[PDB]
Design an enzyme around this catalytic site. Structure first.
Site, short mmCIF file in Angstrom:
data_model
loop_
_atom_site.label_atom_id
_atom_site.label_comp_id
_atom_site.label_asym_id
_atom_site.label_seq_id
_atom_site.Cartn_x
_atom_site.Cartn_y
_atom_site.Cartn_z
N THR A 204 -14.60 5.97 23.96
CA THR A 204 -15.29 4.59 23.56
C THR A 204 -14.85 3.52 24.45
OG1 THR A 204 -15.33 3.13 21.65
CG2 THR A 204 -13.21 4.52 21.90
N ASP A 205 -15.58 2.36 24.30
CA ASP A 205 -15.50 1.19 24.95
C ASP A 205 -14.35 0.34 24.49
OD1 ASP A 205 -16.70 0.27 22.53
OD2 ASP A 205 -18.11 -1.14 23.55
N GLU A 206 -13.68 0.81 23.14
CA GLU A 206 -12.68 0.14 22.64
C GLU A 206 -11.18 0.32 23.47
OE1 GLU A 206 -12.96 0.13 18.47
OE2 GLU A 206 -15.36 0.24 18.52
N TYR B 238 -6.99 2.86 16.22
CA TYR B 238 -8.06 3.99 16.41
C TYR B 238 -8.16 3.91 18.12
CZ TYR B 238 -12.96 4.93 17.97
OH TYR B 238 -14.04 5.70 18.54
N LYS C 241 -7.84 6.97 20.82
CA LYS C 241 -8.84 7.25 21.91
C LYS C 241 -8.27 7.11 23.17
CE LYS C 241 -12.07 8.78 21.25
NZ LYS C 241 -12.76 10.17 20.84
N1 NAD Z 1 -20.06 5.67 16.41
C1 NAD Z 1 -19.82 4.92 17.60
O1 NAD Z 1 -20.07 3.88 17.59
C2 NAD Z 1 -19.05 5.41 18.70
C3 NAD Z 1 -19.03 4.82 19.82
C4 NAD Z 1 -18.69 5.36 21.12
C5 NAD Z 1 -17.61 6.52 20.78
N2 NAD Z 1 -17.45 7.28 19.67
C6 NAD Z 1 -17.12 8.49 19.57
O2 NAD Z 1 -17.86 9.61 19.44
C7 NAD Z 1 -17.38 10.58 18.63
C8 NAD Z 1 -18.18 10.86 17.37
O3 NAD Z 1 -18.16 9.62 16.84
P1 NAD Z 1 -19.34 9.63 15.30
O4 NAD Z 1 -19.37 7.91 15.05
O5 NAD Z 1 -19.99 10.58 15.27
O6 NAD Z 1 -17.94 9.92 14.22
P2 NAD Z 1 -18.02 10.13 12.76
O7 NAD Z 1 -16.88 9.67 11.93
O8 NAD Z 1 -19.72 10.33 12.25
O9 NAD Z 1 -17.91 11.91 12.82
C9 NAD Z 1 -16.58 12.37 13.29
C10 NAD Z 1 -16.99 13.99 12.97
O10 NAD Z 1 -15.65 14.57 13.53
C11 NAD Z 1 -15.13 15.73 12.29
N3 NAD Z 1 -13.85 15.93 12.46
C12 NAD Z 1 -12.86 14.68 12.01
N4 NAD Z 1 -11.66 15.29 12.29
C13 NAD Z 1 -11.76 16.71 12.77
C14 NAD Z 1 -10.87 17.68 13.09
N5 NAD Z 1 -9.79 17.65 13.17
N6 NAD Z 1 -11.50 18.91 13.44
C15 NAD Z 1 -12.87 18.91 13.51
N7 NAD Z 1 -13.83 18.18 13.31
C16 NAD Z 1 -13.10 16.93 13.01
C17 NAD Z 1 -15.51 14.92 11.03
O11 NAD Z 1 -15.78 15.94 10.18
C18 NAD Z 1 -16.96 14.35 11.46
O12 NAD Z 1 -18.14 15.38 11.45
C19 NAD Z 1 -15.83 10.13 18.28
O13 NAD Z 1 -15.17 10.74 19.29
C20 NAD Z 1 -16.08 8.57 18.63
O14 NAD Z 1 -14.60 8.02 18.93
C21 NAD Z 1 -18.49 6.62 18.79
C1 TYD Z 2 -17.60 -2.55 8.42
C2 TYD Z 2 -17.75 -3.98 9.01
C3 TYD Z 2 -17.74 -4.45 9.89
N1 TYD Z 2 -17.71 -5.85 10.62
C4 TYD Z 2 -17.42 -6.04 12.02
C5 TYD Z 2 -16.44 -5.39 12.63
C6 TYD Z 2 -16.96 -5.65 14.18
O1 TYD Z 2 -16.88 -6.50 14.87
C7 TYD Z 2 -18.49 -5.17 13.95
C8 TYD Z 2 -18.78 -3.58 13.77
O2 TYD Z 2 -17.58 -2.70 12.97
P1 TYD Z 2 -17.70 -1.39 12.89
O3 TYD Z 2 -18.99 -0.73 12.32
O4 TYD Z 2 -16.43 -1.01 11.99
O5 TYD Z 2 -17.45 -0.73 14.34
P2 TYD Z 2 -16.38 -1.16 15.65
O6 TYD Z 2 -15.22 -1.88 14.82
O7 TYD Z 2 -15.93 0.05 16.25
O8 TYD Z 2 -16.87 -2.36 16.59
O9 TYD Z 2 -18.80 -5.45 12.70
C9 TYD Z 2 -18.11 -6.80 9.35
O10 TYD Z 2 -17.97 -7.94 9.82
N2 TYD Z 2 -18.01 -6.17 8.19
C10 TYD Z 2 -18.01 -5.05 7.85
O11 TYD Z 2 -18.13 -4.66 6.68
#
Ligand code: NAD
Ligand code: TYD
Ligand code: NAD
Ligand code: TYD
Ligand code: CL
Lengths: 322, 322
Positions: A127-129, A151, A155
């Site tokens: 992730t970008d974070e 978090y 990562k």
């Molecule tokens: N959602 C986003 O905006 C975002 C942005 C960039 C990167 N990512 C990265 O992409 C990946 C997937 O993100 P997501 O939003 O689909 O997450 P999510 O929370 O929807 O899903 C995470 C999945 O991992 C499984 N999991 C958790 N711990 C585990 C373990 N110990 N063993 C096996 N499975 C396990 C959970 O059961 C779940 O199905 C993560 O690595 C996240 O850091 C997500």
């Molecule tokens: C979950 C949540 C997020 N936010 C803000 C936090 C972040 O600036 C943005 C997205 O939050 P989030 O979905 O938690 O993703 P990330 O922290 O990885 O960027 O929205 C709110 O203002 N209210 C909420 O209830």
């Protein structure tokens, strides 16, 4: 052509799996796909229901931390796409340990097992974070790691573990970094599905602080397509940013969501800000474009519209998650 | 004035403890010093024997991963100096997991507990290896994290965890990074004590590859004094390099050790190189000098001489460790 996808019952992972099996990635041939997922609060078997009839799919309910299990499931595996992780910033602030545990230690276990099983290549999804916050401009693959939340620090630690596995053991691992994803099957604790579903439930929207924070948004379909491009043609040890991002303040996004649902400002409440809240994320995706030809194809306006409709038509999926 | 020192029965940690109790750090007042050490193969109660009569010292045989224990031992603690870690690169290549476990997860546990116990400030002791390798020049506090070995990746991950604890919870944590240390009580698996003790045992010296790799060397006494300066007067969230380093190739160092012992080249053997072996480390220590006034005071030639003599006179200490 045997692939293993960790976290494939989560949001992004499941989309990658459904697409791969659908044949959207002609360059990634899938003869057999194993999904390994521990089904935490975020994993959901229903995310894979559209493909459970697929004979090529094997679902394994298990953990990336289980070396026993991996040593056996990885036999003959050619590639791994690693999505498994604890992914919510708020959870990380409330209870950080599980982030180190799954994200850093789980990644270490998985990669060690990959080396022991002779796995060909791995794509580590990040992730970008990891870059912290950026006032002006966009980060490149050489930007420094300056994570602010537990978090993000977990990562970044897992990305460092990936680098070491490549440098010390010769493991072909590629890292991808992306901005905020949105789309169907996203858990309702995340901003967009949280706000959309609150509205559908006739509730209010908890907007942190002033809502000035900025995020870039990409439809998960585009993110997954960039991951498939990296899998098929990236280079060992490289990092690739997957852009797309239409940059918005949370305030402006909130306004777009209210409109998409026929609601108004009276539904929004201003809440205390998130501890260490990152002010702005912005990723430069020139590298993947110039090297692999990746360009996002889903416009925000269309993607967002389909997404909102999906939530409107799938209360049966999300209700239980809230 | 209650301090807790993790890893204080190890090499560097014990030196810091003996010096603090000796009163070498007038600016760090020590009313009570608790040492927390799990006594792995590297911890040794004898490193603290010179001070066990000190009434101000409390020795705790326990682990940084034990949140139960820390929640109680940290009550009333004003500052922590954190040395506890798995520290050998070769061990990390042979068995990486324990490095993530102690270094990353242990650090997370310790810092969470510090936040819960209201600890005033913490000094997180780290290493130059987090920066990878550098052909020419020296790294600064802004150099990027590009760890090559599992040990380095675990130490970098722990530095990221420290940053997040400062950014999210407001914990006053300071990070120090240093080059290779040498001096009395160093475990004999490390280059200098390994070669010195092999010679004293009439054995050969396993010099990796060609011996062209470069390291900077600082006497642990100087390293510890810089840590005390950071403890007393550094700033929250900052990183400080502790220099000193006389830069040598391992070949040239080997030659100095042979001479110090009256031996010759016929005692050296060329062995297969270490996997992912870092070619060169070099740290720039201008920041700590300009900000805190730190300058090394032990010359290599004198420090090394006293060190070799110490090994000659302490076979009773090192023999059991081999
Ligand atoms: N959602 C986003 O905006 C975002 C942005 C960039 C990167 N990512 C990265 O992409 C990946 C997937 O993100 P997501 O939003 O689909 O997450 P999510 O929370 O929807 O899903 C995470 C999945 O991992 C499984 N999991 C958790 N711990 C585990 C373990 N110990 N063993 C096996 N499975 C396990 C959970 O059961 C779940 O199905 C993560 O690595 C996240 O850091 C997500
Ligand atoms: C979950 C949540 C997020 N936010 C803000 C936090 C972040 O600036 C943005 C997205 O939050 P989030 O979905 O938690 O993703 P990330 O922290 O990885 O960027 O929205 C709110 O203002 N209210 C909420 O209830
Ligand atoms: N020796 C060097 O050249 C060098 C250079 C710079 C930085 N460092 C850092 O300085 C620190 C101390 O290094 P050292 O050379 O004294 O190491 P060492 O191996 O001599 O000692 C490590 C100590 O930590 C203890 N320990 C290990 N795991 C523990 C756990 N889970 N809980 C509690 N105690 C635990 C061990 O018992 C031991 O006493 C480490 O953080 C190392 O990364 C060392
Ligand atoms: C332990 C050892 C190290 N070396 C080399 C590896 C390094 O380049 C240097 C110091 O090694 P070491 O003491 O393991 O410390 P570090 O890896 O943290 O720098 O000496 C040998 O040539 N032979 C040995 O037996
Ligand atoms: Cl960096």
């Amino acid at each position: 052509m045997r692939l293993l996808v960790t976290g494939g019952a989560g949001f992004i992972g499941s989309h990658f799996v459904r697409q791969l099996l659908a044949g959207a990635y002609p360059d990634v041939p899938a003869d057999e796909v194993i999904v390994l997922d521990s089904l935490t609060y975020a994993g959901n078997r229903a995310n894979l229901a559209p493909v459970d009839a697929d004979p090529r799919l094997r679902f394994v309910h298990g953990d990336i931390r289980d070396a026993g299990l991996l040593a056996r499931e990885l036999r003959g595996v050619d590639a791994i796409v690693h999505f498994a992780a604890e992914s919510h910033v708020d959870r990380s602030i409330a209870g950080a340990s599980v982030f180190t545990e799954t994200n850093v230690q789980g990644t270490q276990t998985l990669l060690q097992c990959a080396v022991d099983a002779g796995v060909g290549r791995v794509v580590h999804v990040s992730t970008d974070e990891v870059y912290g916050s950026i006032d002006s401009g966009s980060w490149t693959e050489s930007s420094p790691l300056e994570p602010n939340s537990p978090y993000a620090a977990s990562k970044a630690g897992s990305d460092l573990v990936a680098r070491a596995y490549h440098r010390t053991y010769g493991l072909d691992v590629r890292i991808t970094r992306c901005c905020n994803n949105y789309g169907p099957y996203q858990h309702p604790e995340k901003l967009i599905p949280l706000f959309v579903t609150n509205l559908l439930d006739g509730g209010t929207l908890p907007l942190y602080g002033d809502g000035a924070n900025v995020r870039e948004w990409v439809h998960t379909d585009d993110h997954c397509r960039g991951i498939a491009l990296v899998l098929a043609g990236g280079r060992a040890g490289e990092i690739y940013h997957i852009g797309g991002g239409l940059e918005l303040t949370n305030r402006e996004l909130t306004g777009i969501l209210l409109d998409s649902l026929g609601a108004d400002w009276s539904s929004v409440r201003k809440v205390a800000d998130r501890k260490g809240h990152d002010l702005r994320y912005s990723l430069d995706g020139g590298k993947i474009e110039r090297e692999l030809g990746y360009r996002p194809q889903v416009s925000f306006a269309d993607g967002l519209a389909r997404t909102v409709r999906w939530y409107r038509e799938n209360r049966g999926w999300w209700e239980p998650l809230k």
